[PDB]
Each structure stands twice: as C-alpha cells, then as structure tokens.
Amino acid sequence: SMKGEPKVIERLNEALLLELGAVNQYWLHYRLLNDWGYTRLAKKEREESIEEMHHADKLIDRIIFLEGFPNLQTVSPLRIGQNVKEVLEADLKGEYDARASYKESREICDKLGDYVSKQLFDELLADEEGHIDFLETQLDLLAKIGGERYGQLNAAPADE
Amino acid sequence: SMKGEPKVIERLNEALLLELGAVNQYWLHYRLLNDWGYTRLAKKEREESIEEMHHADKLIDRIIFLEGFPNLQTVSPLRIGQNVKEVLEADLKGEYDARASYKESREICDKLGDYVSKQLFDELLADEEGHIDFLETQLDLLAKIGGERYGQLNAAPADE
Amino acid sequence: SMKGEPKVIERLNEALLLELGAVNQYWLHYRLLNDWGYTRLAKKEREESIEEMHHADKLIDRIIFLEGFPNLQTVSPLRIGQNVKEVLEADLKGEYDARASYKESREICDKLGDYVSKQLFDELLADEEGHIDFLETQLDLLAKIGGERYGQLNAAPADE
Amino acid sequence: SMKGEPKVIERLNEALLLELGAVNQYWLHYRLLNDWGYTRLAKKEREESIEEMHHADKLIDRIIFLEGFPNLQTVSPLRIGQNVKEVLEADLKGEYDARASYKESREICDKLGDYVSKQLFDELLADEEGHIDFLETQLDLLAKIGGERYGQLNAAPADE
Amino acid sequence: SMKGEPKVIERLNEALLLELGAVNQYWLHYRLLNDWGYTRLAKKEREESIEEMHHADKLIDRIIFLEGFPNLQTVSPLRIGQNVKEVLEADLKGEYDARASYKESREICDKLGDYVSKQLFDELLADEEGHIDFLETQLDLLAKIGGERYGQLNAAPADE
Amino acid sequence: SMKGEPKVIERLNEALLLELGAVNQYWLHYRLLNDWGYTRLAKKEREESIEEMHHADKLIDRIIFLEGFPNLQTVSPLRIGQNVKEVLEADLKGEYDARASYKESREICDKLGDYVSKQLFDELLADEEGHIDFLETQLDLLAKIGGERYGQLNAAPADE
Amino acid sequence: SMKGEPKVIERLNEALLLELGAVNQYWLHYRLLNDWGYTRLAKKEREESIEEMHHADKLIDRIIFLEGFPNLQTVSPLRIGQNVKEVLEADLKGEYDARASYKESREICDKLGDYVSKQLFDELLADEEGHIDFLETQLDLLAKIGGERYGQLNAAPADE
Ligand code: HEM
C-alpha cells in the first residue's frame, strides 16, 4: 500500500496553501502593475503566477497519490503592494515564507522515510531560491537607480 | 471620474469569489478524475478550470478599472465529488449558483446605469448557460447508458 | 412547348411534401440526439437532412421547368422519436413512405410518357433504398448489442 | 433547473415559424429567379435562404435547451413574387414581419428575466435590419434605373 | 450474335441525321453571332455545337456495334436565324424536334427489347431537355429586358 | 417602413458631432506631438484618430439607414494641449464627454424601442471606457515617473 | 418491410452463378495465356476477371439487402480454351450467355415492380455489351491479320 504519512500530507497541504496564496498575490500584482503603467514588470509577474500554478498542481497530484485530500478551500494571507517597490517586497517576503516552509518540510519527509516527497520539496526549495535571487536583484537595481527610473525601465511607451 | 458604484464593485467581487471557487473545484476534479482513470473527462475538466480562470481575470480587471479592490483572499465553498456522477452534479450545482448570481448582478448594474458592467455580467451569464447545457447533456447520457459505460467512454486505454 | 402533365406535376409536389417533411424530421432528430449526448449519430442525422434538402431542390427545379408551381407552403406530418431507437424507427417509417410514393410516381410518369421525370423518381427510389439499408442495419445492430451499448458507441467522450 | 418560461418558448416557436417560412420563400425565389434568367440575384437569394436556415437552427437549439419542443410541423404563409420587383418586395415584407416579431419577443424575454434569450432575439433583430437595408437599397436602385436595367444588371451572359 | 434490330438502327440513323443538322446549325450560328458582335452568346453556341458532335459520335458508335451502317451522307434541314432572337428560336425548334424523335426512339427500342439502346436515347432525351431549359430561360430573359439589352449583355467590349 | 425616431437621429447626429471633434483633436495632437519629439505617443494618437474615424462612419451609416441626414457641417469644440500632459488630459476630458453622451443616448434609444441603435451606443460606450482606461493609466504613469521621464520614454532616438 | 420478391432473388442468384463462373474462367485464361507467352492479352484477361469479381460483389450485396441468401456454393460451367482464339471465343460465348440472362432478369424485375433491381440488371447488361464489343473486335483483328501475328502483337519480348 501507498497510503502516505499523515504528517507528510499535512506538509504538502501547508505548502499548497502557500502556493495558492502566491498565485493570487502574483496575479493581482500583475493587474495592478498593468493599471499603473508598468507593463514589462506586469508581464514578469504574470509568468511568476503561472509558475506557482504549476507548483500547486504538482502538490495536489502528490497529495492525491498518497491518498490524502488536498485542501483548496482556503488561501494563505495575501500581501498587496501599493507601489512598485512594495509589490517587489511583498513578493519577496512571500518567497522567504515559502523557502522556510519547504526547508522544514523536506526534513520532515526525510526523517519519516518518504524520499520521493523530500525530492519534491527540494525541487520547490531550489525554485524559490531562484525567485528570491531574481527579486533581490531587482530591488538592488531599484535602489541604485531610484524608483522612478526603475519604473520607467519597466514601462512601455504608449504605442505598445 | 471613473470611480464606480460601490454596489457594482460588490457584485463583481461576489462574482469573483464564485469564480475562484469554481477554478479550484474544476481543477481538483481534474486531478481526482485522472487518478480514477477517467482521463478524457479529466481533460474537459482542466479546460473548464482554465476557462473560469479567464473569467476571474476579467472580473479582476473590471474591479481595478472601477477603482475598487478585488478580493482574492477567500474562496467560495467547494463541492467535491467522490465518483463520476457526483463530480458532474457538484459542477452543475456550482454553475447554477453562478447563473443566479450573474442574473441578479446584471439587473443591479442595469438599474444603477453601469452598462459596460451589465454587459460583462451578460457575457458571463451566457457562458454559464453554455456550461450548464454541456453538463446536463452529459448527465442525461450517463443516466441513459449507465455510469459504468459512461466511465468507460470517458477513460483511455492503458497505452495512452 | 414543355408544359408538363398535370398528374406528373402533382406527383413531384407530393414528393416535395414528403421531402420537406423529412428535412425537418432529420434536422430535429439531429438536435435532439445532440442534446441527449449521441453526438456521432447526431452528425449522421444532420447529413441525412442535408441530403434530403438536395432532393427537394431537384424536385422544385423539375416542377418549375414543367411550368408548374411547387408547393412549399405545407409540410408532411413529422414523426419525432423520444429515444435513440424511436428516432431510428421514425426515420425508417418515413423512408418507406417515401419509397412507396416514388414507386407509384415513376409508374405514373412512365405511363404518361414523361421519361425524364420517371428517371428522377427512379434516382430518388434508389436513394431511399440506400437510406433504408443503412437504417435497417443500425437497428439490427442496436438489437444485437442492446440500446445502451448502441448509445455508447454513438456518443463522444466529454473532451470532444 | 433550466426549464424555461412557457411564454419565452412560445416566442421562439413563433420566430421559428417565420424563419422556416422565410427559408422556403427565399429558396423558391432563388429557383424562380434562375428560371427567369436573373442568375446573379438568384445567387444572393440562395445565400439569404441559407442564412435563415442557420437562424432556424439557433432557435431550435435554444428551444430544446429550455426543455421546450420546437414546432417544425407548420410553415408561416409564403409570399411568392412573379417578377423581379415583386420578389424583392415579398422578401422585404417578410423581413419587416420578422423584425416586428423579434422586437416584441426581446421585450417579453426581458420582462421575464430570460436575458440569454433576449440576446438571441437582439441578434436576430440586428440581422433582419441588415437584410432590410440591403433589400431597400436594391429596390431604390431598381426604381432609379428601371426594372429592365435592374434585370440586365442581375443576369449573366449566356456563356456563364 | 450482336446484329441489331433493323428498326433500331433506323432510329439511330434518324437521330444521327438530326444531330449532324444541329452541329452545323449551332456552328453557323456561332460564326454569325460573332460577326454581329455577340461574342458571349457566340461562345455558348460553339460549345453547344461541340456537345452535339459528341452525341453524333455516340450514335455512330452504337450503329457500328449493332453492325449497321451509319449515314453521314445527308444533313437534316437547317434553320438559320438572322438576328439574336431568331437564332435562339431556330435552336429551340431544333431541340424540340430532337426531343420528340428521341422520345419515339426509346419506345421503339423498349418494345423490341434493345435496352442498351433505349438507355442511349434516354440519355439524349435528358440532354435535350437540358438544352431546352437553357434556351427557354434565355428567351424569357430577352423578352423581359428587351432584345437590345439582351444583345448588350451578350457582347463584349471592343478591347476583348 | 424603417424611418427612424427623430429623437434617435438627433442623438446619432450629436454623437457624430463629438466624433468628428475627436478625430480632429487626436490628429492635431499627433502632429503636435511629433513636432515636439514624442514620436511614440504621436503614433498612438494617430491610431486613436483613425479609430474615431471608424466610429463616425458607423454613425453616419446608421443615420442614413434611418432615413435621417447626418450633419458633418460642424465640429464640436476642440481641446488642444500645449505639452504632453495637457494633450493627455484634453483627450481624456473629451472621452468623458463622449461617455456621458453615449450613456444618455442608449437610454433614449432603449425607451423608444430602437434596440439596434441602443446596441450601437452600447458598443461605443464600451469603446470609450477602453480609451479612458488607457489614458488614465498613462497619466498615472506620467505622475509617478515625472513628465520628463514620461517624455523620454515616449520619444525615439535620432536615428529613427 | 424490404423482403424482396422470391423470383427476383432467384434471378440475382442465377446471375451470381454466371459471374462466379466468369471470374474463374477469366482468371484461368489469364494464367494459361501467361504460360503460353501472351503476356499482354493475359493482363487484359486478369482485369476482366477482377471486373466480374466486382459485379459478383454487387449481386451478393443486393441479394442480402432483399433478405435472400446468396449461393456461392456452386459455379456455372467453365469454357477453357487451348489456344488464343479459343480463349477469346470461350469468353465471348460466356458474355452472350450473360447478356441473355440479364436481359430476361431486367424484364422479370420490371414486371414485378422491383425497379432498383431492374436498374442493376440494366447496368450489368450495358457492361456485358461493352465486353462483347471488345472481344468481337479482337477476334475480327485476329482473323484479318492471322493468329500468329495476333499472338505476336499480344506477347512481350523476353526482357519484360
Ligand atoms: C488551483 C489554482 C490554479 C491552478 C491549479 C492553475 C493552473 C494553471 C495551469 C496548469 C495553467 C497552464 C499554463 C500554461 O499554459 O503553461 C494555467 C494558466 C493560466 N491561469 Fe491558472 N491556475 C490556478 C489559479 C489561477 C487563478 C486564480 C487565475 C486568475 C485569473 C488563473 C489564471 C490563468 C491564466 C489566464 C492562464 C493562462 C491563459 C493563457 O495562457 O492564455 N489561474 N493555470
């Protein structure tokens, strides 16, 4: 039998809650950024949302294989920025929360002997550190050239 | 100024809550159906989820244009089936809920003079009646040929 | 002069009345079958309707050439099935009615010396016996594998 | 449940009766025009018939979705012209009848809250006013250049 | 042995005499029409001549197969028009003569049991009624728009 | 008869007056922007002018169909900016004027039962709210990054 | 019901018996001709066999449609030639037998009112007179140039 560990399912569900939160956060940021004129940042944000959708699908699939029930009924609390730098910082804070949850989860899976699930958390963890490297670089850039120049760089002219 | 009616924003947010619910419901049904072997139904269910994602994006965009704040923080309650016919019925019940909310909303927008928003609700309404025609036909079919033959029809052989 | 025999025009008009009936019957059966889930049978039924449309056009053209007036004002009485086997049987009964009317009509044209019109009825007659061979085979099949398996065979999975 | 309003089904059936009438009228006009030599007008008339066939299919589909029974058993009374200008006028009179029936029907659907059906009648209404603009222009042309020149314009030379 | 009925050969030869007449009539009409400026009618007339050439070849072939001798030595009397409407009427009169000869001939072949020859006369008969429908339509057109407009329609401008 | 309501024609003419105004305003803004160096904004402005030309053509066509006379003799008063932000604001003010006129007009058409014209005003209304969303986003951008950076973003380098 | 006339089925079976005979005769002639070196005649003979196979399939299909049982258990007596001219004459004798049986059969079908079957016999009859024209021409040729030259003409050189 393939019935998984209850503590393992719990961690996948906890990870799923964060991923659904991040999907919604990134998508709302995409629409707000677009409304503010920052069409190029907006596009990156849409892609980040779609990437997290793919993660959530992977977690769902692993939960059902372990004969657990995935919880899509509730969403982890959203951080909504009100200008460009706040959007980047709200996202980064979310990715650190995610990193820390995935770090704890791979250790729990490891101790309980569920090594395929550990491997899933390890892949999520390397992902989030990817997103974290990206966001921290953008924020350094914003700080070195200033918000208004970072805004201009990430906006399109009116004929696009 | 384009600041919208507060009652109108409320209806768009209420519609958004149902759409996020339906996205999650349809996607979970897709994964459960796949796990049970019904790969062809599963695929239709994935597409229904993606279609509702597009609706939710449209509502979000309209809320932000009216200078409201879209609520993605909470999800309307999910109906999760445990066999094929329950999946179809849970979906249909959700689409009737949606129809009724969109019918009320186009009337509120109409009375308040926000005719572009009325037109959005009218397009959602014709959509949901599309999904409702589809689901009711499948359920009639299931009833006339029986669940196990409806299951067989909607499953793939092992080499696909 | 090409003014045709009054009895000949009468038979073409009588044939036209049956063809308009069959066009409507087959088309309504197409839509009902589709609503019930039998999309593959439905498609064959649409094509049968379109074929009878072509026959009706041929009769109309022959009536006008003989300087008669084609009657499109009334439609011969329709047989509407309420399940798959009734649809097939209602169609077959209509095709036998048609066969018998065309058999009588080619004899009347023959006796009156209008051999081009005889040839039109002969072509319609061979057609209807084509449709009759098709319907009788389907009904034998339905009887040997059972209605619910005949229904399943003639339905599409949900992703089509 | 999706069971529709009885008054709404009645209007769709009334519209269907007019559309079947117009299909037959336009098709008979096509064949008569061709017999008289007006092959170019004839072709436009064939296309108008086929367009109304598509409308009738849409009404049928909406009736069956509302769980009514579409009546294809009877055809609304035909107006058959005996020269070019009479053909155009008989058609135009039919399109005004249609316009008026669709105008009443969208109001009935609107009052009863069946807004998807209202939207169908609104699309038919804009269609018929399209056909009406076309016919009225042709008739003005006929009047300004004279019937025999309008006939010549709408006929082909003998090698086509 | 395949030696045919003497009465049957006689009818094929009688039909051949009419076809050779019609070949010559149509070809002369083609050249006269061209000389008068009616290049488009002229072209249709050339094709009608070539079609009758094909018929004459078919009759010749059937006569020789029945071990008769086809008579190409004499031509049935020609009707030569002197203006457009006379050309059309001379042709039509010839096609009615042909129709009547082919109608009698298929009956003679039928009574004598030569059913392949009957079938040849039946195909010629349906042909001639084709040509008759065409000519009668053109003549109706000529009458409704007038000879000079029918002439103009069937002429080319000077640069063609 | 298709003679339209006098009050309806009046609204179409009033809408036409605003559209001709906007065509001229947008085109003059295009040329002024180009002269000032803002070639990318200039291009968007040319396209906005051409879009309003298409609207004016639609109104003209509807007026003539209703047997009214479209007034192209006078142009609604123009708002001409003298720097980038004034150009955007003059345009936006014009689009709000337009929105409000189209909102009133669809209500008048609705009350008078001219539903095809209502549908035209509804399509114009959704258009103008499109243009309004675009302009308001650009102006927010201008305000957040500053006029001179918004100018730089919307200008081309000297080799283009 | 489509149950056919017993006398009609009998004629189709009688025709089928002749066709199976001719299939076997022509195929054996093909192989014997090839063995004797007459590879070009041999090829024509193979095609004649395959054509008669197609006829036999048509008769079989018509018998089963009329709810008779086709008799493939016995073969009509074969005529086997022992040189080229005997092969051609044996074939021709078989085709005359066939012609005569099909002539009688179309009359029986005609008297009994089975006109689709009459039409099948009429098509077979015109076929056989085709084969008869071909064979009689070849035999005339053989007689005019002599057997050994007819043999040489219908043989291939050794490198083919
Ligand atoms: C359980 C939650 C969700 C799941 C499992 C999910 C899953 C997916 C997947 C697998 C894709 C395919 C992307 C691709 O084509 O590579 C996708 C695309 C997309 N998603 Fe989600 N998603 C979720 C939530 C949302 C939400 C809340 C929205 C809000 C609008 C959304 C909007 C979209 C859109 C617009 C697309 C792509 C449309 C296009 O490419 O044209 N999704 N989603």
Ligand code: HEM
């Ligand atoms: C006098 C009665 C009718 C005549 C003469 C007629 C004739 C025709 C003809 C010649 C075609 C062309 C088919 C092709 O493309 O090969 C056609 C197609 C069609 N007919 Fe009819 N028809 C009649 C009645 C109807 C009715 C009652 C309906 C009901 C909806 C209908 C619906 C259609 C449709 C949907 C098509 C083809 C559309 C497509 O291919 O996308 N027709 N008809």
Ligand code: HEM
């Ligand atoms: C200041 C006044 C106007 C200016 C400067 C202007 C300028 C232009 C230009 C440069 C074009 C490009 C044509 C091409 O593609 O070669 C154009 C096209 C066009 N204009 Fe105007 N125009 C003016 C007034 C109008 C008006 C009053 C109308 C009324 C409807 C109109 C309708 C159109 C349309 C429909 C097109 C082309 C659309 C197509 O090609 O599909 N214009 N105009």
